[model samples]
Target: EVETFAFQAEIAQLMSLIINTFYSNKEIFLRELISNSSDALDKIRYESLTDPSKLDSGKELHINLIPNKQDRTLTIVDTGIGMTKADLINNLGTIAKSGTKAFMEALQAGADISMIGQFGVGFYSAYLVAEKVTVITKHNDDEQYAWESSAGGSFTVRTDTGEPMGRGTKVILHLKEDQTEYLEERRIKEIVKKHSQFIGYPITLFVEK
Candidate 1:
């Protein structure tokens, strides 16, 4: 069901934008991810009305925030729509297929500020706060896959080893020394509510005991 693949040029450019530009506040990383999680949740929740089996595995549509203050590692898990290899490349690697061309045309056209964020590269924002980031995702139609990167020039994707989530994804953020503020529960919560409060999905925070 799931497979591995390489990222395309467009995907690479999109990732570059996230690792280089886009997010200003490192904390906004959480907001971007949570926003994506909410979108996934909405996808499955709506799809379930027809095929209940889709919920048979990962029924709950939610987001989990795991913060490690000591290690400065922040993990955000979501029970939302996962990605296939194509999705991994197309979604994470490059900008939107059509939108990207349009954005570039607009920029050349001297259009107002571009909305590259709409291309769905928001998840890569995790690199802004972490030196290394890991993503484990499971999709309804594809096999689970793991994607890892250090915000460097390249990234790697492999087949998932463990049992895949019923339906959703998890992102682990290894925060940088200066980005430790994201490890704070209060700070994480504030960011989520502020940016994704009205989102369609519920969000949860998990702290180390």
Candidate 2:
């Protein structure tokens, strides 16, 4: 069964604001995504400390960046703490955290770029360069599922019958007309080094043959 929900009123407005304000600095979208991936990985690692089995038994913790020119898509995959169906709805559909609301208020009050990292809404920044964003994730507590949105205020989630990911999340960004630069390996490396070098996990860029 597929589930659909609308973003909270304020979240919808914040999406619009982020897309418009970050038009020139769209590269930050990659930075934010990678940062989120790092946090997810950190969460799972911490959880594993209490329950050793929490870490995927055989999977290594890492992030992979794969760019496909033919499809004009850039994918970021991470072996991190994935989300359950309800987690998807609560995290992506609404302002699940008060920090998100505060971030919006700060943006509206003319806060500058420094305010970007304070909110948990960084995932939506993908809309700055993507026509559509798809997240395929598998959490130990939930079955594999896919969540998708075009930043149109509503998103849909459905069971993903594809191959199991073992554990973690994969985000595919379908590039927009002028956002093809994101599909370049060199550009991705530059962005990663500039914004995500301090990330704890190893980040790898897949090379094309």
Candidate 3:
């Protein structure tokens, strides 16, 4: 059985606004998710400073966007530092509580804070276009876990028994009928052009070219 947890007040409230009201642009959800993925990779970049063993495998570090017309799902997969069950609970369940933000604060040389760290609200914006969202993640120190929600003011987290992930997070969005525009190739490219083009890591968006 999976465990379900309530969202913080503002999180529930904000989700309602995003899903109910026309909040400017829905494409922002893609940007936010991609940025969050980049932030996770930044986490691994920081970790490699002390111990390079995790990097010894030379695994690819980038983000991949895969759209499934048959499944009505859009999955954004990142080869970065993934999450544990606790991370899934805290990060996706609450607003303004980003663990990546803490790491950004710690990266002070009076440093530029190379990574964008606000992942909480950004992560939740997936609700704008998707009826349900599932995050399948694997951390180097923990087993794979799945976090799922349908914006019912609550979400679930459980150990995943399916294919074990390589060390990253996969944010899967079940697109609502009206929002399938997001599943197209052109729109996704335009989104990246406007938002994540400057991101350091390679972003491989699979849509048959």
Candidate 4:
């Protein structure tokens, strides 16, 4: 039998907070996204150690930035553990960290600590920078899927139409006029080094002619 699922009510409230509160510094959206990609790569590398066959396709774990100045599009591609349709919905639509309530309770009980992944709403950060965003991902456990959203409190996920990546994910951002600053190679490089210089994986940038 097939499974069915729906988002919890609190997710809508959190989504509103993320979209409205972070508008002051929109560039940090990119940093958050790159950081997410790095985490995905780390996940695969850990798995590859035990399953050598996981690397059979010879895919390098790296992030590539493709900028289309004329079209005003910036694509961030990653060679990491990609997501399936369900993964996309769960990761992007709702909060994956259901234990967030416990974290809040702990904090209320005078606990001095920062909870990590207590809010799995990082993926929705994309809406802050782009008028439209497309996510292309290839999963090891299932067929590839493409997820798209416009921050209108809704999103769509579909199966891959072309050849899937060896393994990993790519998110293409159709930036608004103001957000086009990220299309500059120098600017993007600067932000990458400033935020992810010490990251174990290499990040590359490509500019359209």
- For model 3, how does the per-residue alpha-carbon lDDT over 157-204 read when each residue is reduced to its tens digit? 888988878799999999999999988899889999998999999999
- Please list the residue runs of candidate 2 whose C-alpha ends up more than 4 Å from where it truly belongs after superposition: 20-22, 91-97
Predicted structure with the largest TM-score when compared to the true one: 2
Stretches off by above 4 angstroms in model 3 are: 56-58, 90-120
| lDDT accuracy of residue 34 in candidate 4 | 84
lDDT of 2 by residue, 1-209 (tens): 88888877676766677666644778888888988899889988888989988875435889999999999899999999888887887754554446567886786699754456667667877888888999999888988999988877878899998888978999999988899999988898999999888988999999988
Computed on alpha carbons, the lDDT of every model, listed in order, comes to 0.71, 0.83, 0.78, 0.70
Estimate the Cα RMSD of every predicted model relative to the unseen true structure: 3.7, 1.9, 6.5, 4.6
Rank ordering of all candidates by TM-score, starting from the highest: 2, 3, 4, 1
Full candidate order by lDDT, most accurate first: 2, 3, 1, 4
Model 3 accuracy (lDDT, Cα): 0.78
Candidate 1 contains a number of clashing pairs equal to 7
Q: How many times do residue backbones clash in model 4?
A: 0
What's the lDDT for residue 33 in model 3?
90
Expressed as tens digits, the lDDT of each residue in 1-209 for candidate 1 is: 34445445554554565556544556666777777788778788888999898887777777788888776788878787677777776654444555545554564576422244564555656667777888888888888888887744566788888865766888888877867888887887788878778876667787678
Clashing pairs in 4: none
What value does the lDDT take at residue 20 in candidate 4?
A: 57
